[PDB]
Design a binder for this molecule. Sequence first.
Ligand code: WZO
Length: 181
Amino acid sequence: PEHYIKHPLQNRWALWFFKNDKSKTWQANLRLISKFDTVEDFWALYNHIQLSSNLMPGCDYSLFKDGIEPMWEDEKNKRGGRWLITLNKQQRRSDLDRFWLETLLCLIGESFDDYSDDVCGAVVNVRAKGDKIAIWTTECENRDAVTHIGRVYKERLGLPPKIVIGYQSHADTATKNRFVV
Ligand SMILES: CO[C@@H]1[C@H](O)[C@@H](COP(=O)(O)O[P@](=O)(S)OP(=O)(O)O)O[C@H]1n1c[n+](C)c2c(=O)[nH]c(N)nc21
């Protein structure tokens, strides 16, 4: 068995793509690429798509658990929020791709212990003004889950203790940090 079975992931995941088109609504610009639920199928997908740093400004990738759309309105995101990584323009070259892949691995490898169940997915925004990476979680009032996910994520990214990252609820973003680590 170990010689021919793929390695199943805890969760099936869906990769989404967003291309800004002023001709369409935001939701009409968001498309599902494909889904996977093994390590092998994850790396097959990741190895055939563009690195985030090579996307055009205005594009996103989103990696979300099967059944959760990468939008605030999903029942699993409307009460939640995001740990937000803000990148300056110089970090598109130095950090964006390595941070995104670490984020992807934090998700599929369930790296936040028993609070990995609060994780909905992650989004990378490629923007001329500054790129963003974020991990979305389901409930912004869950202090322990949100704090634990942020502390782990910060250290997995290897961010310096001299900086903080913040967590904002989607309700506030849709109209301030609820947590900082
Ligand atoms: C309606 O306008 C929303 C938002 O204002 C716009 C830009 O979101 P975006 O995250 O692209 O902003 P940035 O380009 S990185 O710049 P900033 O504004 O975050 O500093 O895209 C829309 N948008 C975004 N998101 C994530 C949703 C959603 O989940 N749902 C609906 N319905 N719309 C959404």
